Amino acid sequence: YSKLSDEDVLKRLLQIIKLEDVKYTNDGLEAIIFTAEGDMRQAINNLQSTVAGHGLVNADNVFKIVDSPHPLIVKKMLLASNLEDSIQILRTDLWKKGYSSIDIVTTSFRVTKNLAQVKESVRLEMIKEIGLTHMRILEGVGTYLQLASMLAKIHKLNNKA
Amino acid sequence: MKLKLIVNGCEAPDDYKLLRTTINTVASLRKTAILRFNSERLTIISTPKDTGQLWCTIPHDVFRLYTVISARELNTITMECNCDSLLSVFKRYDRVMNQGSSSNMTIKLQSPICALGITFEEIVHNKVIMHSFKVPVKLLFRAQDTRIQEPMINYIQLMMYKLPPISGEFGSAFHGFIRRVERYSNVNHIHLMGVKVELKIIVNELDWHLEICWNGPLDSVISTHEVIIRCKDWKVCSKLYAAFEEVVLAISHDESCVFHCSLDRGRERGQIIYYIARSKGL
Amino acid sequence: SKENLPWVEKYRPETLDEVYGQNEVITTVRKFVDEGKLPHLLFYGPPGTGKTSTIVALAREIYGKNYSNMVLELNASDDRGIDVVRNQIKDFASTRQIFSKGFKLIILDEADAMTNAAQNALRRVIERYTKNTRFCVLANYAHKLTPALLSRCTRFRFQPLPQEAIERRIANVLVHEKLKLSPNAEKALIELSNGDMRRVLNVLQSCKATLDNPDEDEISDDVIYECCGAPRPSDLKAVLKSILEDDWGTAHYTLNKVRSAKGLALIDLIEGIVKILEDYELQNEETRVHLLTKLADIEYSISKGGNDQIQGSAVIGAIKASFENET
Amino acid sequence: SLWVDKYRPKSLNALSHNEELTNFLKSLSDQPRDLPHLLLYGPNGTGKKTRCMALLESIFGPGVYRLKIDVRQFVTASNRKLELNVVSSPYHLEITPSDMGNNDRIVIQELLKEVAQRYKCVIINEANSLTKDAQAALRRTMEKYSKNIRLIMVCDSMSPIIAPIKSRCLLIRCPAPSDSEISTILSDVVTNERIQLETKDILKRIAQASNGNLRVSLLMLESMALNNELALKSSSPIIKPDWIIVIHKLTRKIVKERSVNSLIECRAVLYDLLAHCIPANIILKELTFSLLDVETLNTTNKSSIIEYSSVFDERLSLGNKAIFHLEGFIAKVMCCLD
Amino acid sequence: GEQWYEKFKPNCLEQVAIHKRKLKDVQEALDAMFLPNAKHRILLLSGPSGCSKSTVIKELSKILVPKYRQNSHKVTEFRGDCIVNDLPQMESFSEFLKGARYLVMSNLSLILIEDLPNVFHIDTRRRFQQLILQWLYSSEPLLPPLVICITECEIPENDNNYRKFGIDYTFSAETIMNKEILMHPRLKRIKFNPINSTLLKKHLKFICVQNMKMLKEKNKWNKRQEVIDYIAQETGDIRSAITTLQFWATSSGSLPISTRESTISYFHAIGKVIHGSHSTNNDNEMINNLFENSNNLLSKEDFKLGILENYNTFNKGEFSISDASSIVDCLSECDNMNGLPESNEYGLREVRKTFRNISKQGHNHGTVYFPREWKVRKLQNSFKVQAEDWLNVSLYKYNAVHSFRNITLEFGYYAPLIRKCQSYKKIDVVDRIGGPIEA
DNA sequence: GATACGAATCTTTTTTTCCGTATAGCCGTAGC
DNA sequence: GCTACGGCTATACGG
DNA sequence: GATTCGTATC
Ligand SMILES: Nc1ncnc2c1ncn2[C@@H]1O[C@H](COP(=O)(O)OP(=O)(O)OP(O)(O)=S)[C@@H](O)[C@H]1O
Ligand SMILES: Nc1ncnc2c1ncn2[C@@H]1O[C@H](COP(=O)(O)OP(=O)(O)OP(O)(O)=S)[C@@H](O)[C@H]1O
Ligand SMILES: Nc1ncnc2c1ncn2[C@@H]1O[C@H](COP(=O)(O)OP(=O)(O)O)[C@@H](O)[C@H]1O
Ligand SMILES: [Mg+2]
Ligand SMILES: [Mg+2]
Numbered sequence A: 001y002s003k004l005s006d007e008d009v010l011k012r013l014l015q016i017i018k019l020e021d022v023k024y025t026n027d028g029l030e031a032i033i034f035t036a037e038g039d040m041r042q043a044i045n046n047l048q049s050t051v052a053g054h055g056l057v058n059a060d061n062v063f064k065i066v067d068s069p070h071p072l073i074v075k076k077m078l079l080a081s082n083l084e085d086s087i088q089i090l091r092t093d094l095w096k097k098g099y100s101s102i103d104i105v106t107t108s109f110r111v112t113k114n115l116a117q118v119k120e121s122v123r124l125e126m127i128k129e130i131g132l133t134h135m136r137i138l139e140g141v142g143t144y145l146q147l148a149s150m151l152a153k154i155h156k157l158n159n160k161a
Numbered sequence B: 001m002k003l004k005l006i007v008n009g010c011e012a013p014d015d016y017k018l019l020r021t022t023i024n025t026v027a028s029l030r031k032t033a034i035l036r037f038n039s040e041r042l043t044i045i046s047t048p049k050d051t052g053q054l055w056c057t058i059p060h061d062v063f064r065l066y067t068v069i070s071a072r073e074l075n076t077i078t079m080e081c082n083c084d085s086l087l088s089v090f091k092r093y094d095r096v097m098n099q100g101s102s103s104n105m106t107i108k109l110q111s112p113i114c115a116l117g118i119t120f121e122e123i124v125h126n127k128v129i130m131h132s133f134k135v136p137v138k139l140l141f142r143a144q145d146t147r148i149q150e151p152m153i154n155y156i157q158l159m160m161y162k163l164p165p166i167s168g169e170f171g172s173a174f175h176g177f178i179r180r181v182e183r184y185s186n187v188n189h190i191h192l193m194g195v196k197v198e199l200k201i202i203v204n205e206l207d208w209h210l211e212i213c214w215n216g217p218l219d220s221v222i223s224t225h226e227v228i229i230r231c232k233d234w235k236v237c238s239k240l241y242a243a244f245e246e247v248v249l250a251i252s253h254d255e256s257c258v259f260h261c262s263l264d265r266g267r268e269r270g271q272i273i274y275y276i277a278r279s280k281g282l
Numbered sequence C: 001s002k003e004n005l006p007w008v009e010k011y012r013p014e015t016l017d018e019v020y021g022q023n024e025v026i027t028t029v030r031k032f033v034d035e036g037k038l039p040h041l042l043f044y045g046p047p048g049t050g051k052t053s054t055i056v057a058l059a060r061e062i063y064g065k066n067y068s069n070m071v072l073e074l075n076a077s078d079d080r081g082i083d084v085v086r087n088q089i090k091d092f093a094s095t096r097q098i099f100s101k102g103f104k105l106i107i108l109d110e111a112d113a114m115t116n117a118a119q120n121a122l123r124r125v126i127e128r129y130t131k132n133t134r135f136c137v138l139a140n141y142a143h144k145l146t147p148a149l150l151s152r153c154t155r156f157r158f159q160p161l162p163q164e165a166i167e168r169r170i171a172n173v174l175v176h177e178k179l180k181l182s183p184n185a186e187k188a189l190i191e192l193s194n195g196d197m198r199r200v201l202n203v204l205q206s207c208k209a210t211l212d213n214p215d216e217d218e219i220s221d222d223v224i225y226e227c228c229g230a231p232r233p234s235d236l237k238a239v240l241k242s243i244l245e246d247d248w249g250t251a252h253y254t255l256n257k258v259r260s261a262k263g264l265a266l267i268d269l270i271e272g273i274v275k276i277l278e279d280y281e282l283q284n285e286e287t288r289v290h291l292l293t294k295l296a297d298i299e300y301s302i303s304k305g306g307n308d309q310i311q312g313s314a315v316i317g318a319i320k321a322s323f324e325n326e327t
Numbered sequence D: 001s002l003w004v005d006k007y008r009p010k011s012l013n014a015l016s017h018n019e020e021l022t023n024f025l026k027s028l029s030d031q032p033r034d035l036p037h038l039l040l041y042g043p044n045g046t047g048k049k050t051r052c053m054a055l056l057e058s059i060f061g062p063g064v065y066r067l068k069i070d071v072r073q074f075v076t077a078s079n080r081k082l083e084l085n086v087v088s089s090p091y092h093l094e095i096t097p098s099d100m101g102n103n104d105r106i107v108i109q110e111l112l113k114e115v116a117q118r119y120k121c122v123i124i125n126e127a128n129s130l131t132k133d134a135q136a137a138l139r140r141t142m143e144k145y146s147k148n149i150r151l152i153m154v155c156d157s158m159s160p161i162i163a164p165i166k167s168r169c170l171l172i173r174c175p176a177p178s179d180s181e182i183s184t185i186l187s188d189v190v191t192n193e194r195i196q197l198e199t200k201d202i203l204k205r206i207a208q209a210s211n212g213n214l215r216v217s218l219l220m221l222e223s224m225a226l227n228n229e230l231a232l233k234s235s236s237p238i239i240k241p242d243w244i245i246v247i248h249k250l251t252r253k254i255v256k257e258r259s260v261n262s263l264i265e266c267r268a269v270l271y272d273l274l275a276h277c278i279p280a281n282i283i284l285k286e287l288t289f290s291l292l293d294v295e296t297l298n299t300t301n302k303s304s305i306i307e308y309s310s311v312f313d314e315r316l317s318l319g320n321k322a323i324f325h326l327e328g329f330i331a332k333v334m335c336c337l338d
Numbered sequence E: 001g002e003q004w005y006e007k008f009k010p011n012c013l014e015q016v017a018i019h020k021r022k023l024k025d026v027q028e029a030l031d032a033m034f035l036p037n038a039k040h041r042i043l044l045l046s047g048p049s050g051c052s053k054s055t056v057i058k059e060l061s062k063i064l065v066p067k068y069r070q071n072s073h074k075v076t077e078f079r080g081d082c083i084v085n086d087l088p089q090m091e092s093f094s095e096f097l098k099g100a101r102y103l104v105m106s107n108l109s110l111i112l113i114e115d116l117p118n119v120f121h122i123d124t125r126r127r128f129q130q131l132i133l134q135w136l137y138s139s140e141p142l143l144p145p146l147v148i149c150i151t152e153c154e155i156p157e158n159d160n161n162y163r164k165f166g167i168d169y170t171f172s173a174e175t176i177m178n179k180e181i182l183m184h185p186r187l188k189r190i191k192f193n194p195i196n197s198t199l200l201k202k203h204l205k206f207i208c209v210q211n212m213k214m215l216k217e218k219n220k221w222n223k224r225q226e227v228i229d230y231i232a233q234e235t236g237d238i239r240s241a242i243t244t245l246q247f248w249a250t251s252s253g254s255l256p257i258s259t260r261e262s263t264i265s266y267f268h269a270i271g272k273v274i275h276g277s278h279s280t281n282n283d284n285e286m287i288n289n290l291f292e293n294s295n296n297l298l299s300k301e302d303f304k305l306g307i308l309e310n311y312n313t314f315n316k317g318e319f320s321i322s323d324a325s326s327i328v329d330c331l332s333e334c335d336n337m338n339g340l341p342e343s344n345e346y347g348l349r350e351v352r353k354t355f356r357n358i359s360k361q362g363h364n365h366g367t368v369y370f371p372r373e374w375k376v377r378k379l380q381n382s383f384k385v386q387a388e389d390w391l392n393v394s395l396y397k398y399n400a401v402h403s404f405r406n407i408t409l410e411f412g413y414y415a416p417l418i419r420k421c422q423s424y425k426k427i428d429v430v431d432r433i434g435g436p437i438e439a
Numbered sequence F: 001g002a003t004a005c006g007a008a009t010c011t012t013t014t015t016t017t018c019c020g021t022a023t024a025g026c027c028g029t030a031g032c
Numbered sequence G: 001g002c003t004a005c006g007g008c009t010a011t012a013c014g015g
Numbered sequence H: 001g002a003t004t005c006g007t008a009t010c
Helices: A006-020 A026-036 A040-054 A059-065 A070-078 A083-095 A101-113 A120-139 A144-159 B013-029 B083-098 B142-146 B169-179 B231-243 C023-035 C051-062 C082-092 C116-128 C147-152 C163-177 C183-193 C197-210 C221-228 C233-245 C248-262 C266-278 C286-304 C308-322 D020-030 D048-060 D104-116 D134-144 D163-167 D179-192 D201-210 D214-227 D242-256 D260-275 D280-292 D299-317 D322-337 E020-033 E053-068 E089-100 E122-136 E197-210 E212-217 E224-234 E238-250 E266-275 E283-293 E301-313 E321-334 E341-357 E373-394 E404-411 E414-425
Strands: B002-007 B033-037 B041-046 B053-059 B065-069 B077-081 B105-110 B113-122 B129-139 B159-163 B189-195 B200-202 B211-213 B228-230 B246-251 B256-263 B270-277 C041-044 C071-074 C104-108 C133-139 C154-157 D038-041 D068-074 D082-088 D092-095 D120-125 D149-155 D170-173 E042-047 E075-077 E110-113 E146-151 E187-191
Touching: A006 A026, A006 A040, A026 A040, A026 A059, A040 A059, A040 C023, A040 C147, A040 C154, A059 C023, A070 A083, A070 A101, A083 A144, A083 C286, A101 A120, A101 A144, A101 E341, A120 A144, A120 C286, A120 E283, A120 E341, A144 C286, B013 B041, B013 B053, B013 B083, B013 B231, B013 B256, B013 B270, B077 B083, B077 B142, B083 B113, B083 B129, B169 B231, B189 B231, B228 B231, B228 B270, B231 B256, B231 B270, C023 C051, C023 C154, C041 C051, C051 C104, C051 C133, C071 C082, C082 C104, C082 C116, C116 C147, C163 C183, C163 C197, C183 C197, C183 C221, C197 C221, C233 C248, C233 C266, C233 C308, C248 C266, C248 C308, C266 C286, C266 C308, C286 C308, D020 D048, D020 D170, D038 D048, D048 D120, D048 D149, D068 D104, D082 D104, D092 D104, D104 D120, D104 D134, D104 D149, D134 D149, D134 D163, D179 D201, D179 D214, D201 D214, D214 E404, D214 E414, D242 D260, D242 D280, D242 D322, D260 D280, D260 D322, D260 E301, D260 E321, D260 E373, D280 D299, D280 D322, D299 D322, D299 E321, D322 E301, D322 E321, E020 E042, E020 E053, E020 E187, E042 E053, E042 E122, E053 E075, E053 E110, E053 E146, E089 E122, E197 E212, E197 E224, E197 E238, E224 E238, E266 E283, E266 E301, E266 E341, E283 E341, E301 E321, E301 E341, E321 E341, E373 E404, E404 E414
Parallel strands: C041 C133, C041 C154, C071 C104, C104 C133, D038 D149, D038 D170, D092 D120, D120 D149, E042 E146, E042 E187, E075 E110, E110 E146
Antiparallel strands: B002 B065, B002 B105, B033 B041, B033 B077, B041 B053, B053 B270, B077 B129, B105 B113, B113 B129, B159 B246, B189 B200, B189 B228, B200 B211, B246 B256, B256 B270, D068 D082, D082 D092
């Protein structure tokens, strides 16, 4: 069984709206599909929560009740050009949002495993850096400084020396 | 290496009961047992080498015939046998008289690994039914026999308690006192108490305490004596106490516990000693 | 006997309106309760954000008096293996309601510590007996949960406590305990809290203990820093100025004097300097890398221990060498 | 038996190679009631164990050397039998983590709990072999049971000893003797048993070939004495351990040939050395120092060798399989020398 | 109505998908095992699933049992799910063996143990070991032939613990049988290989022409050839191939053809990491699929040791020392990560990148080998025993406590030399402990 | 006769849960 | 009618 | 996956 496409998820979702007769917005349905990430049960749960908490399903209410998938945020953080933007994204999207450092490290490892448009040497160097950071987090040092250093080393290896 | 013996349970009751009790004890303790056939006595040894050791002495006059000959010193034939086969043979032979008979049990050493030809007869009611058995045993070497010795007990702080005979008025009460700690399922250590006569069974744990005490009359043959031992050895002590009238308890302060059982055959007396190491320190 | 309790387990909210900070989650679960439909909730966030208090108050609000038999709470303190999940959870979420109708509530506190087989067995119980039972999962680490369990559970994110929630809770505590707090001490307390209410309550209790006579005495920032043993911002600024501008001998002397004045720890100074330097504007992007890397290994070495003076000299040298790239 | 224990000083006054350390030991043994836990650190073969035995004799009288060797059984968290040998003696206990690996915590725990129940001295040889958990138990065991037990552990390079244990002990240093003192001890030995001894220079050669090791020097003296038909010669060759010769040959091969096939041969040599139960840390140490005595290497090559040695011995300390770090160090040396 | 692999089962030896050499040396072994005095007591068959291991034994028993049987046809298969009232579970196999031992003269029947008893429980596994050990060492004058077929499959991860055993990782004959059973004079082992493309294509064509009307009705007859070739290329399992062909034929749409994925062997994975894999030029994708499909083998210290041992076989050792230094440095760095998945990923990626950068056409590689660390451990155990003997004799004839560290450093070589001259010129241990050190 | 194809070889010694056996306790019936 | 002992069963242990 | 030796087929 392959991952559900956006069109099939949209069709089933629209069937559920027509059966339940709730107000919706196309942008809200697009946001629900985007957050679901091919999971039909997650889409149904998010839609039900949005209807039961705010009523009309727009992008604003959906993004105010449910959060954007953190793998995409981590992928955006790792692919940043300069270190300042990556640091700002990491802070304001994972540290102020209440995401554990070990979760960030595991998500970074998964993203690097499934990261395209990068060289093999760069990919393995970032894997090694993420592994060292993972060891440091597991041993007890789970502060924001370790994640900042990991991002700094990743950018240093990206832009070479 | 010519070992042969004959046992008649009906002719001599007490020593046959002693032999049966020794076999039951060595079977309950652990699998396999050491049979040392010295020319003047038979010693049955159960050496686990913390767990206890049973050293029972059986004189040669117990059996009707005791031809023991070997090239070793004092005709010492040492053998290791599975207790379960010997226990089954003894149960069959006990049921032979229970159904009604007086036949003797002939045992011969028929061939290092050998076997004993324990054969006896049985008569149902005037029919002849020959019961033949062969228990596989191994022959312990002379040096290996020398590696097994009875552990000597120091008398610096060891104190004797003469437990009441079970045939007396206080015997049943003392047996109940001994088995009073066995009715607890979650017990693994019994911490004894003797101050200088009282015997106290104390089982102290995280959230429960036990203070079994003996208020009856006791004798010490002729100061605090505490030793904590496992519950399984106490079960063996209770079983030994029921089958022996003369029972002597020796307690060493934080060293060991000795359960001495003696059968007055007078004649050499048959004795059973169960050395028990402390499970842990006070 | 609530006066005989630590302040952390003294101000635990009893109703949903007593939980501050997570306004969105509270409003959503209240709308769920009023509508009569409650999905399989999943609470995620840093420690001290108010997940257990929120779910306990929600269960009390749903079942006012039948909380004992309508709620089954299991946490890491109890065994939650494959057998417990197979037997006890199924037996609880297999029988009918006693008389309260509604649904049965099962709370899995710290479900991230559960084994994978337990979660695999729990997912079918969740998706099978959902007609009369709803599950709530609380966890601080989402990577330790099965993706299917996250799929069948509605995720609620507990953000770190904002400023205003901390102010309101501190004001309530001050009113209850008849205590006074300076605005500077208030700012110091929120900064060290790091979005944690338990830290705020513990520091407030320690500060009340610090005062010789609790009443008629205000709690200043000096009291906070003396009780918790944290460096003052002025000390951090002076240390950074000495490291950045002065030479090696006087910078070392200043660091030693600052640390020995109050017995400050080097790791606290490192964290303060890291926080201050984040506000700095660096135009080289190599100074940032050098600072972050060198301070990270120094912090790690401090975590493993070693020579303290050597680590302080390492901090000074690392900062100086990193800022030599800005030329 | 061997000459090493034949001339081992049994008494405190019989120690004549440190002087100041002997006076300090006499100071400690003046009032044994206030004797704290002792930690002796110094070069291997110096005689720290001899000093400990002499101190114990100075405290408890002659009889400490009446060693009985016993067999003990231990059980870990799971069902397992640990046949640990105990060499106890009146008022003295000996524990060594050589035979036992990561299970070294429960054995010392049970032994110290049983012995701790005047005081009984416990000697722990090779205190660096503990895995930071037996140390965690030991710190509390000695902090709480200081009344009925005393701990005296000998070690070399006490860096892997945790800070709380070092804080809980008196730090005693045992420097290795000079070459003249080793020569004097050898002269006393050969006076006790005549060995001809044509020239006094060969005693100095033996002393210099041991790098301040009494045991190694005595073994060398006995080996030359037995091989040279109960005599000695000025031109007699210096005898060295077999693994030293193997490491020197490995160094020569590394210097001469630098290739992948030579790397595989070096790996085979390292595997043989590991199979001979020689610890990999000292293998790396000896290989590094044998590389530094090569006269065909410039200062940059030596600096690179020592830097790689530090990096790889740290990695081996923080590692699990020792062959990876040794192979990496040899390959780095080969890639630096070419 | 019936499954194709069941309704098209072979009726004779000619329809069994097996190599001619395999048929020959199984026939010879089985014929020799039916002799009155057979050198080989039992026959062990090992290989992947669906390799005609079970069926060829059946077709051989259809022609061998009726011939050697006395006068007064099939196998006696062990069935493990039989639960007898007065039979403990561990005693079921013992009772089966004791009952089947009475199949020698006028009751001759081959014994086929296709499904073994529960070997994932240690007690019954040891019972199985000591039960088949007694069969080989039995003093019985004649016994019925015994055939044991073991499917070599990798057991997937079930529970999280580092006490995983050989049976817990993979399900093979080496993990089930110990060294005594496998290296026995009266045991003959015939390992099996997956069915080749030729036999698979021939048998799929035979099955297709046996149902010609049903493929011609669904107009799939013209497209049957490419399907047969693709199925035979993908997998080597005859049962899986026949099931997939039946699924494709009974379908009425454009559903893509899929078959079961076979696990990658240890040396196969070593070659994939070192020399790369054909039809996949993306190293990232190959490494990701290798980690996703064979995580049990990759997440082991044996694999890193295998890479360290076999990385010099890329060009018989003919490559730059910088690449070797980089590989060994990366492996040493990975050894310090305490078995994290990132360590294995980084090590494999670095090795693959290093071997890809230097890869050139016309390269003549070498033969890989298993790591020798177990031999080193055995030698260390022997050294430990000899050092214990030395310390015992040194602590019994006299009082001298020497540390094992000193035994390995100096007393392992100096003390034998002392005991040599002392003895020849005139204690127990005279040879160097652990043998001499060579090169 | 050249080549694609196939076989043989390249190998090993803490924590949770589960499967089957051991064992003690209690009830039912034969015998004294 | 009461007690002993054999068979059935629930529980802890082991690997 | 690589090498080496042996067959069957084109
Ligand atoms: N939003 C809040 N409003 C009021 N008090 C709070 C709030 N969040 C936390 N607290 C206080 O902090 C204490 C601990 O918080 P809990 O909710 O019990 O633990 P938690 O937030 O679930 O963190 P973890 O992940 O379980 S360690 C509570 O008992 C309250 O006293
Ligand atoms: N021509 C054929 N050759 C071989 N097997 C065939 C053939 N046609 C059909 N089959 C079926 O394919 C299946 C192959 O099973 P086998 O390989 O004999 O069993 P196996 O070797 O034990 O595999 P496992 O390990 O049990 S899954 C059997 O069910 C056969 O009946
Ligand atoms: N003062 C001394 N005089 C003579 N020999 C000594 C002296 N000190 C030590 N030794 C010799 O050193 C040998 C062993 O030293 P040892 O105590 O094992 O050193 P370490 O404690 O460093 O391992 C002994 O055999 C002993 O003869
Ligand atoms: Mg909580
Ligand atoms: Mg089959």
